[PDB]
Amino acid sequence: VKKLINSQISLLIGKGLHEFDSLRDPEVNDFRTKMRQFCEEAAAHRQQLGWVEWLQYSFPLQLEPNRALLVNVKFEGSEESFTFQVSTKDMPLALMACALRKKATVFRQQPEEYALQVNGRHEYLYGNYPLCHFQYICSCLHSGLTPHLTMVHSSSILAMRDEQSNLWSLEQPFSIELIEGRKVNAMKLVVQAGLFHGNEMLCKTVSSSEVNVCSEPVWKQRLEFDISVCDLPRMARLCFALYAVVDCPIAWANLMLFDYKDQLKTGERCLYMWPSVLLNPAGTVRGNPNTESAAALVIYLPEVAPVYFPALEKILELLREILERELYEHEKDLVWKMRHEVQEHFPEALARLLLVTKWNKHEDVAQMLYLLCSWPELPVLSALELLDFSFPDCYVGSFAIKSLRKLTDDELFQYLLQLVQVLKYESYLDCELTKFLLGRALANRKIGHFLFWHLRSEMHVPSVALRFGLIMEAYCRGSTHHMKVLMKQGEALSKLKALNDFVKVSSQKTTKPQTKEMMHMCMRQETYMEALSHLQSPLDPSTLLEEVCVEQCTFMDSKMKPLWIMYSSEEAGSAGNVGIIFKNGDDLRQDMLTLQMIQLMDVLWKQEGLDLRMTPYGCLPTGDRTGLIEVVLHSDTIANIQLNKSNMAATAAFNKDALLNWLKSKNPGEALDRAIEEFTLSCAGYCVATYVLGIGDRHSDNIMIRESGQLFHIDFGHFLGNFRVPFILTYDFVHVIQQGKTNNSEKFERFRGYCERAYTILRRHGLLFLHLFALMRAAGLPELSCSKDIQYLKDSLALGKTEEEALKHFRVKFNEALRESW
Ligand SMILES: CCn1ncc(-c2nc3c(N4CCC(n5c(=O)[nH]c6ncccc65)CC4)ncnc3n2C)c1C
């Protein structure tokens, strides 16, 4: 029971709980206890919520960002069903009323006491929303399906809730002693060091002497820095970089001069260093957990008495506009001088002010903190900038979190990826971000679900394993029922990896149709049939992966042999037919980030009243170079369509005609003008999106098109011009945009109009894209590793330029892409 839950949580996080105890770090012991209570309390509150409020936790409504329609409905106990005529603008209650009246006429004798469960899905229909706003109904429109719903009474819903229950006086120049080592290299060895607050240095870099290349060296040098003990900030960081010289980095190590309880770090410290794959302030402040092979640096932090960092109470007592839109020294002085009026008249310039203050001056810092305490709540966009590595202070961070509490579950969900990456900056295990995320995660099952997998995937990384395992453990104490749902997924993912290795070996000896049959034999085995069937999709907790259709399952013949897994459900009909791509051996983190952005562009466009028919399909990294991808049904690649396949409905003489012929065959009659509008809008957005993000290697094999006419791109392994990518236009698309005519300038200017509208809309939001890409420098993706990668986004959107200049410059780029297009 208790051991079962503990051994289940270890099974789930992929790390033994005992490994946390064996450290004997009281910070860790303190984190597990504080959080467990926090998380446990959230579950207690959650058990007293009303059935409709419970549905908002467990079944978050999936909405869309005069005409009637057919709809099927039924009840829980009985299996008989009925159909109705209802408006797109009608409410769930209106639908539930006719459903109640039809049962009241068949049964022969209160809509507010029912909820419409989508059959064979983890979705419900309720609230003050017109039937059109629901994704499941909006889906039934384009597919022409019959919505099948179950009338679940308030009593039955509460039965599910029940069954799912669980100081300044020290004015000496700061110094430390450098004792001995235990490393390998061959020359002479040196040890640089330095103090930091964020990216900036608190003083100068003090190197040691050139001891010869050969040992477990001994220096025993008192390294005295160019800064006083009184001038050290609460979040002072001390780096170390060991290297050889006659140029060669060997290892790096960082640590906080203060502890988590605010006390200055005393005496003797052994630092287990990480390799290099010169000085790295961004890197984690905890030591390498591979104690055996990891080299080290033993040092002494001199004592000075039990000294603690001053409490708040103590600190509390201690041509202007022209430049406020980096800066000079005479300007830095002006900004700092005027600091009072920046609070009063320019509160949203806080981030700019914090950068001009001297963090190596406890007076400037006390006066800065003093102002910051009485600063007003900034916007969510401004708060995201305050979570940058440049703002390490806790008071700043705690205030940034204060301003992100207003995020909706959907706005939180949009930024969640970046919020998990900021935890990699965090100096102390317990923090407000962790407190926030975890609290929000326990308030919404979809946020908890998605946060979980964001943590769970990076467990194989040593720098975060401890941090993330602890947060996940906490979540499982708070979400005991969801933990089981998540295990079923883990077991499925566990099998998928085993099955995929088989398929990878098999393909090297045998052939594809044999491997395919061999693979299906493995799937039919007892453990695989139970493990891969019946589970909520990791890509979408509302989709249910029920019966795995083994005959339809396969893999693509491409290096990593990605598995193609297909599902079906009797209870859902066609809505229960869903496919997933399991990938292993490649990192999908970049693909998820490229997709997150495309989806954000669709939101910012949709918010300005512009729907460019984008297809931001699910992609979820779940483990070590492991993840799932969502199969977008009723779609095929341009290469598979351009084949110009023999005796198909799209037989064409030339390549240009292949595309449009495919659309005529999938959208006959009046349906084709809708499909070309769909194609034009989606193409505009994907032309703009791939241009802004710089997505190269765009061949017909990785560009797709839906049977509805919507264009979409796949395989986002290379972004930000890291194969300077130009704007791209293919003649085969221009031809379709032009309704299959060599000259339809009428349509072409509408198209060019969408590319111009879209492009400018994103420039107005250029800072959001920059603010979110700035927090991803924590993640460590090969192509999001420096300011030069952020410079691509600044340049592509042209933020330094005005609207007039950027649009004029973009029209030339658009024309240039049109000239190169044959
Ligand atoms: C990063 C990888 N990635 N990202 C998105 C995707 C991806 N591929 C597809 C797809 N495909 C592309 C591959 C096609 N295909 C083929 O031409 N030969 C095949 N053999 C076996 C299976 C599939 C085959 C079938 C249609 N159809 C629908 N959605 C998709 N998504 C999200 C992919 C594959």
Q: What is the 3-state secondary structure (H, E, C) of 169-233?
A: CCCCEEEEEEEEECCCCCCEEEEEEEEEECCEECCCCCCCCCEECCCCCEEEEEEEEEEECCCCC
The owner of tokens 């959080």 is 35
Best residue among 599, 714, 716 to mutate for probing ligand 1's pocket (most ligand atoms within 8 Å of CB) is 714
Atom 8 in ligand 1: residue holding the nearest Cα: 631
Domain shared by 411 and 316, yes or no:
yes
CA distances from 430 to 337, 416, 576, 611, 759 (A): 35, 18, 42, 42, 41
Same domain, residue pair 337 and 258: no
Q: What is the CATH number of the domain that holds 351?
A: 1.25.40.70
Alpha carbons 186 and 192: distance in angstroms, whole number: 18
Q: Which residues of 661-685 are buried (b: 16+ CB within 10 A; e: fewer)?
A: bbbbebbeeeebeebbebbbbbbbb
On whether both 349 and 237 belong to a single domain, the answer is no
Which residue's CA is the nearest one to ligand 1's atom 23? 556
Please, how many CA atoms are within 13 Å of residue 66, restricted to the half-sphere of its CB? Answer: 0
Which DSSP symbol is given to 761?
H
Please give the Cα distance from 101 to 122 (Å, whole number).
26
3-class secondary-structure state, position 249: strand
Q: How many angstroms separate the alpha carbon of residue 648 from the centre of ligand 1?
A: 20
Q: What is the spatial distance between Cα 431 and Cα 412, in angstroms, rounded to a whole number?
A: 18
Ligand 1 contact, 631 CB (< 6 A): yes
Are 221 and 282 in a shared domain? yes
β-sheet with 296-300: strand ranges across: 218-228, 173-181, 296-300, 268-272
Chain centroid to CA 717: how far? 16
Tokens representing residue 56 in the block: 């908002």
Residue 151: DSSP 8-state: E
In the reported structure, the alpha carbon of residue 616 is separated from the centroid of ligand 1 by a whole-number distance in angstroms of: 14
The token pair at 495 is: 């099998």
Technique behind this structure?
Answer: X-ray
Q: Which two tokens mark 69?
A: 């329609």
Residues 332 and 476 placed together within one structural domain of the fold: yes
Cite the beta strand spans of 108-154 per DSSP E.
Answer: 114-118, 124-125, 148-153
**Residue 139 backbone zone (phi > 0: left; psi -120 to 50: alpha; other: beta):** alpha
Return the structure tokens found at 256.
Answer: 């906080």
Ligand 1 within 6 A of 629 CB? yes
CA distances from 196 to 173, 225, 271, 682 (A): 16, 12, 18, 47
> To which residue do tokens 């003008």 refer?
673
Record the tokens describing residue 741, joined without a space: 């005519």
Maximum distance among all Cα pairs of the chain, rounded to whole angstroms = 97
- CB distance 240 to 221 below 8 Å: no
* DSSP letters for 494-552: HHHHHHHHHHHHHHHHS-HHHHHHHHHHHHHSHHHHHHHSSEEETTEEEEEE-EE-TTT
User: Based on the domain organization, do 274 and 367 belong to the same domain?
Assistant: no
Which residue's CA is the nearest one to ligand 1's atom 25? 636
Please report, as a single letter, which amino acid is at residue 164: Q
Contact assessment for residue 75 and residue 510, using Cβ atoms and an 8 Å cutoff: no
Domain identity same for 457 and 420:
yes
Question: Does residue 663 sit in helix, strand or coil?
Answer: helix
Cβ atoms within 10 Å, residue 787 = 9
- Are residue 326 and residue 188 in the same domain, yes or no? no
User: What is d(CA 183, CA 214) in angstroms, rounded to the nearest whole number?
Assistant: 9
Strands 188-197 and 81-87 turn out to be unpaired
**Measured CA angle at 666 (ends 136, 638), to 5 deg:** 100
Angstrom distance (rounded) from CA 458 to CA 452 = 10
Same domain, 278 and 328: no
**Token pair listed for 276:** 């290099």
Name residue 565's beta-bridge partners: 580
Residues 412 and 467 in one domain: yes
Residue 672 Cα to ligand 1 midpoint, Å, equals 25
8 Å CB contact between 102 and 557: no
Alpha carbons 418 and 466: distance in angstroms, whole number: 19
Q: Cβ contacts of residue 513 below 8 Å, gap of 6+?
A: none
Nearest Cα neighbor of 358 from 348, 371, 350, 368 is: 368
User: For a pocket test of ligand 1, which of 565, 629, 662 has the largest count of ligand atoms closer than 8 A to its C-beta?
Assistant: 629
Distance CA 650, CA 666 (A): 9
Instruction: Note whether 275 and 317 are same-domain residues.
Output: no
**Cβ proximity of 477 and 504 under 8 Å:** no
Distance of alpha carbon 50 from the chain centroid: 31
Picking from 494, 499, 506, the residue whose alpha carbon sits closest to that of residue 557 is 506
Q: CATH number, domain at 221?
A: 2.60.40.150
Output DSSP code: residue 300. E
Name the nearest CA neighbour of 388 among 778, 15, 797, 802. 778
Strand order in the sheet with 635-637: 635-637, 703-706, 711-713
Mapped onto helix, strand or coil, the DSSP state of residue 139 is helix
Q: Which atom of ligand 1 is nearest the CA belonging to 557?
A: 20
Residue in 704, 705, 713, 718 to alter for ligand 1 test, most ligand atoms within 8 A of Cβ: 704
Give the Å distance between the CA of 564 and the centre of ligand 1. 8
| 3-state class (DSSP) for residue 582 | strand
Residue nearest to atom 30 of ligand 1 (CA): 631
Tokens standing for 135?
């994704």
Kind of pairing, strands 68-75 and 148-153?
parallel
Ligand 1 atom nearest 701 alpha carbon: 17
Of all helices (H) and strands (E), which one includes residue 456? Answer: helix 445-457
CA distance 56 to 77: 24
Query: Which residue pairs from 260-263 have beta carbons closer than 8 angstroms and sit at least 24 positions apart in sequence?
Result: 260/27, 260/30, 260/428, 260/429, 260/430, 261/308, 262/234, 262/308, 262/309, 263/306, 263/307, 263/308, 263/309
Count how many Cα atoms sit within 13 Å of the Cα of residue 536 in the half-sphere of its side chain: 19
- Bridging pattern class, strands 296-300 and 268-272: antiparallel
Phi-psi region of 594 (alpha: psi -120 to 50; beta: other; left: phi over 0): alpha
Pocket of ligand 1 contains residue 714 by CB under 6 Å: yes
Nearest residue (by CA) to ligand 1, atom 11, is: 636
Q: Is 92 left (phi over 0), alpha (psi -120 to 50) or beta?
A: alpha
Amino acid at 7: S
Mark whether 372 and 466 lie in a shared domain. Answer: yes
DSSP line for 88-132:
TT--HHHHHHHHHHHHHHHTT--GGGEEEEETTSS-EE-SS--GG
Q: How far apart are CA 556 and CA 690, in angstroms?
A: 25
Helix axes 480-509, 512-524, angle to 10 degrees: 150
Of 581, 583, 594, 598, best ligand 1 pocket probe by most atoms within 8 Å of the beta carbon: 581
Distance 142 CA to ligand 1 centre (A): 22
Ligand 1 centroid vs 692 CA: distance in angstroms?
24
Q: Residue 738: which of 655, 659, 645, 632 has the closest Cα?
A: 659
- Identity of the amino acid at 409: D
E strand or H helix at 440: helix 432-441
| 338 Cβ below 6 A of ligand 1 | no
Residue 613 burial by Cβ neighbours in a 10 Å radius (0-12, 13-18, 19+): buried
CA 632 to CA 682: how far, in whole Å?
Answer: 15
- Report residue 649 as tokens: 């409905």
- Full residue range of the structural domain in which residue 232 is found: 173-300
> Rounded to the nearest whole angstrom, what is the distance from the C-alpha of residue 695 to the centroid of ligand 1?
18
Q: What is the rounded CA–CA span in Å between residue 472 and residue 500?
A: 27
Taking CB atoms within 8 Å and a gap of at least 24, the contacts of 378-381 are 378/347, 378/348, 378/350, 378/403, 379/348, 379/403, 380/404, 380/406, 380/407, 380/411, 381/767, 381/768, 381/771
